[PDB]
Ligand binder design. Sequence first.
Ligand SMILES: Nc1ncnc2c1ncn2[C@@H]1O[C@H](COP(=O)(O)OP(=O)(O)OP(=O)(O)O)[C@@H](O)[C@H]1O
Ligand SMILES: [Mn+2]
Length: 336
Amino acid sequence: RMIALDGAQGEGGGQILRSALSLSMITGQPFTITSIRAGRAKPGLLRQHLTAVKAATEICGATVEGAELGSQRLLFRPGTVRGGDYRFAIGSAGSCTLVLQTVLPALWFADGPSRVEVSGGTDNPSAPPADFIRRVLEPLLAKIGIHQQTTLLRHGFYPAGGGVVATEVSPVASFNTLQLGERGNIVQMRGEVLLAGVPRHVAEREIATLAGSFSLHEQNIHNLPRDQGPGNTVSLEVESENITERFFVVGEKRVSAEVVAAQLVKEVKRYLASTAAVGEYLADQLVLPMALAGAGEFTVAHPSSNLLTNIAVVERFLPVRFSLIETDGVTRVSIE
Ligand SMILES: Nc1ncnc2c1ncn2[C@@H]1O[C@H](COP(=O)(O)OP(=O)(O)OP(=O)(O)O)[C@@H](O)[C@H]1O
Ligand SMILES: [Mn+2]
């Protein structure tokens, strides 16, 4: 028919559009969306979102109205999804991985394998880093029966970009059921700093803060050429018995090293203070995979707007339904 979506849903960001594109491509169901990111400083499609739309259009031969920078309304009628070897350029420090997030789910259903390469930003503070996709999400996707492998080829920091991320994907042969309960005991914590055009002592100070609070099985410092930067990220990977999670912060010019690491330690203790298996962000990224699988569940401490938006969009496009039940400060998200 036609699914009409309100871009103001939830936190009114690009997530509704990315999820709609994936599900539209997969199901063949057309959608219209209005008020796209209408309440933002730079409203409508930014280069990240336009590149997502262009990639979706190209992969499935879509009929489209409104794909242009700044547009707040899109109409998208998908055609047949084709596997293949694709390359896209954002042309800004917009998130490579969010473009990949948009089109990879459609490729889980093509006849043969695909590869998608996107150039743009790689360490955006409000997007999943390539290492998160590779080390946290993808191992879970594998348990669901979805096989994709993401590799960061080059870093590209804000505002220059020029980073490159690629993902190899194979069509799903069979889906499996993944049920995540409590997080389980800690097995290993691993701290990591990335540096580009930033003095090496910044990294040591950042790690020292992390180690003061946590027993670290690893302390890693990665130095890159100065053209990939100026950039700085601090990450903590938490391996528990039942799951691995990963949290990260991005240093800024007028914020110091010791406090950059401090807000990471804060975010991480927030995760550990709950028994929830999955963190805030991973939760919204498991909704579509489990929905397409027809089964699955996980626990999360505080269901976010993006999580709830993703569930709502899924339910408009697919016959699946989600249950959300809270037990003692932890919400179990499950397919009915
Ligand atoms: N620190 C993080 N680690 C892993 N994934 C993240 C992290 N931060 C955000 N994400 C993921 O990136 C996506 C964010 O989409 P969202 O709509 O929030 O875009 P945004 O970058 O905040 O900009 P806008 O909301 O203005 O479009 C969600 O899937 C979210 O889970
Ligand atoms: Mn957002």
